[PDB]
Amino acid sequence: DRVLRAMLKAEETCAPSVSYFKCVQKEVLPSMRKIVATWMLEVCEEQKCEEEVFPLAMNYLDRFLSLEPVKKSRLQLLGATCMFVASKMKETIPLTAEKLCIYTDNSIRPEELLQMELLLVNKLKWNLAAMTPHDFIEHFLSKMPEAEENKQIIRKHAQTFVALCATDVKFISNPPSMVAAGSVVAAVQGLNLRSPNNFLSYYRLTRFLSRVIKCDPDCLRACQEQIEALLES
Amino acid sequence: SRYEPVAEIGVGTVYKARDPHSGHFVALKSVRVPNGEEGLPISTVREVALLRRLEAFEHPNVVRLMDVCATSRTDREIKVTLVFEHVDQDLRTYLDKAPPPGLPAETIKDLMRQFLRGLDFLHANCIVHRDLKPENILVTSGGTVKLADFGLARIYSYVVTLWYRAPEVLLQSTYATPVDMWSVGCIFAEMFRRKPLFCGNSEADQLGKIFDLIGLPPEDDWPRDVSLPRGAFPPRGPRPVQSVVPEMEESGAQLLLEMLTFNPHKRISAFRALQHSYL
Numbered sequence: 376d377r378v379l380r381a382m383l384k385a386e387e388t389c390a391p392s393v394s395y396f397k398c399v400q401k402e403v404l405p406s407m408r409k410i411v412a413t414w415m416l417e418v419c420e421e422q423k424c425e426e427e428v429f430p431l432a433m434n435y436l437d438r439f440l441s442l443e444p445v446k447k448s449r450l451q452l453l454g455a456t457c458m459f460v461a462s463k464m465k466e467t468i469p470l471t472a473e474k475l476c477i478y479t480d481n482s483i484r485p486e487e488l489l490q491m492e493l494l495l496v497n498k499l500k501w502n503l504a505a506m507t508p509h510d511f512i513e514h515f516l517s518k519m520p521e522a523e524e525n526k527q528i529i530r531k532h533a534q535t536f537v538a539l540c541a542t543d544v545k546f547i548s549n550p551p552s553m554v555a556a557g558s559v560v561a562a563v564q565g566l567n568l569r570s571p572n573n574f575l576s577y578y579r580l581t582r583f584l585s586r587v588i589k590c591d592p593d594c595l596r597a598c599q600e601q602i603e604a605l606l607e608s
Numbered sequence: 609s610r611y612e613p614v615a616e617i618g619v620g621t622v623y624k625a626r627d628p629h630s631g632h633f634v635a636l637k638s639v640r641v642p643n644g645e646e647g648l649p650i651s652t653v654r655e656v657a658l659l660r661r662l663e664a665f666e667h668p669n670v671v672r673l674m675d676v677c678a679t680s681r682t683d684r685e686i687k688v689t690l691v692f693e694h695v696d697q698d699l700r701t702y703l704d705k706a707p708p709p710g711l712p713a714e715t716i717k718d719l720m721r722q723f724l725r726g727l728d729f730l731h732a733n734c735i736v737h738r739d740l741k742p743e744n745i746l747v748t749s750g751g752t753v754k755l756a757d758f759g760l761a762r763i764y765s766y767v768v769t770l771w772y773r774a775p776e777v778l779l780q781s782t783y784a785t786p787v788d789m790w791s792v793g794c795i796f797a798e799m800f801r802r803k804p805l806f807c808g809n810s811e812a813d814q815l816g817k818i819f820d821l822i823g824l825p826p827e828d829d830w831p832r833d834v835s836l837p838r839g840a841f842p843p844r845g846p847r848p849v850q851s852v853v854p855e856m857e858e859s860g861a862q863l864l865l866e867m868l869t870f871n872p873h874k875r876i877s878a879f880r881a882l883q884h885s886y887l
């Protein structure tokens with residue numbers, strides 16, 4: 376498709392830097408991002424958010440961290456602000472500033488979150504409709520030879536993998552199309568192991584999805600292995 | 609970037625500036641949106657972001673939004689600056705500059721094809737311009753036509769010409785995607801005669817002007833909710849398009865009438881108009 380080639384272009388313009396912890400950030404470390412990422416996932420699950428809110432919010436956080444140094448005391452404020460902008464972009468009823476501050480035990484106040492919003496939206500140059508692995512999983516599923524029943528289960532497992540991947544630093548290096556293909560492959564491999572006669576898309580699915588993204592099958596394989604190793608922990 | 613201004617493009621107010629690194633000229637448009645308890649208005653965040661999303665398609669017939677910044681902030685207002693690649697002239701200037709007799713028919717068809725290619729792309733991406741005019745239809749040095757000033761209705765909401773407004777918006781009946789197509793018919797005819805087809809000072813005077821060419825619509829054609837009743841307009845018959853629009857071939861006048869159709873449900877779409885034999 377021609378929309379797929381525009382999605383792959385759009386994700387190259389919303390790309391975070393794989394070296395921001397070394398080059399940009401002086402106090403923020405991966406363990407801190409994992410804690411703020413885990414907290415954001417908990418807020419989304421509790422608030423019954425649209426599944427895309429959490430990977431979109433993480434996408435905003437990595438991009439902002441790639442351009443602006445942030446004090447480790449203001450990382451939670453940044454995570455809450457990323458969820459706030461992501462909620463407005465992907466939800467009919469966006470999360471309120473005070474509903475996000477409640478989840479910080481009111482250590483941050485709405486005013487601080489509204490000031491961060493201007494900073495975040497400006498540093499991202501209002502590129503807020505960023506592609507998320509969820510957009511790619513849908514494109515891959517239509518192409519895949521599976522009955523609607525199987526696509527719903529593949530969609531569920533792949534999205535769980537995308538959420539797990541977002542907490543880890545591998546979400547920074549791999550573009551959303553890569554995270555989506557690695558998660559779909561990890562999901563179909565798991566489903567085929569449980570039912571060998573079903574989910575027959577497993578067969579050389581890495582090579583298949585690498586032709587759709589025009590990537591190296593070795594990189595997609597490395598991505599899939601990284602995602603599966605994360606699931607074990 | 610921190611674009612330094614060069615001149616004022618015109619009028620709310622658009623300025624011309626040089627990109628400090630690229631060196632390319634850009635057009636700056638500033639809009640004011642309310643600063644609520646929930647910070648940036650949700651419509652402003654969604655609408656501007658969706659405009660940014662359109663740049664990935666790299667459509668040749670639309671203006672490119674290359675930078676956005678919330679430059680100012682007070683307790684009651686947030687100022688958003690939109691940076692667009694500069695286009696040297698607008699359709700009106702292009703039409704006025706051309707010497708007599710007028711623009712060649714081939715030139716008109718090519719401009720119409722580009723206008724309709726750009727309008728269909730907006731229509732496909734759930735955008736309705738709602739204020740299509742020669743001033744907002746920009747023309748590049750190469751002759752490429754690029755549409756501008758669209759998708760900002762929510763932020764622009766929170767004086768102007770009615771010459772291109774569809775009869776439904778004048779009657780305050782149903783805002784719809786086909787209103788742009790009615791404006792295309794007005795622009796299309798204006799390319800041949802080099803003058804606005806309908807000039808109305810009032811919302812009822814504009815309708816009266818429309819019925820002088822298109823005739824008076826029948827009661828069945830009349831919309832369910834009307835601000836102004838049919839009985840308010842005199843019984844006018846349909847006037848041939850050729851009488852008011854010069855040097856237009858019969859197939860062009862047929863296409864013009866498909867765009868200038870009172871009922872928006874029967875009105876030609878941008879995609880159908882592109883498939884027309886005249887184009």
Ligand SMILES: CC(C)n1c(C(C)(C)O)nc2c(F)cc(-c3nc(N[C@@H]4CCOC[C@H]4O)ncc3Cl)cc21
Pocket residue numbers: 617618619620621622624635636637671690692693694695696697698743744746756757
């Ligand atoms: C002027 C008007 C249509 N306009 C409005 C408003 C809200 C006022 O309708 N916003 C506008 C905006 F944001 C941008 C432009 C624009 N202008 C140029 N070039 C100018 C165009 C006119 O001829 C002289 C050229 O120098 N290039 C690119 C762009 Cl994007 C025009 C805008």
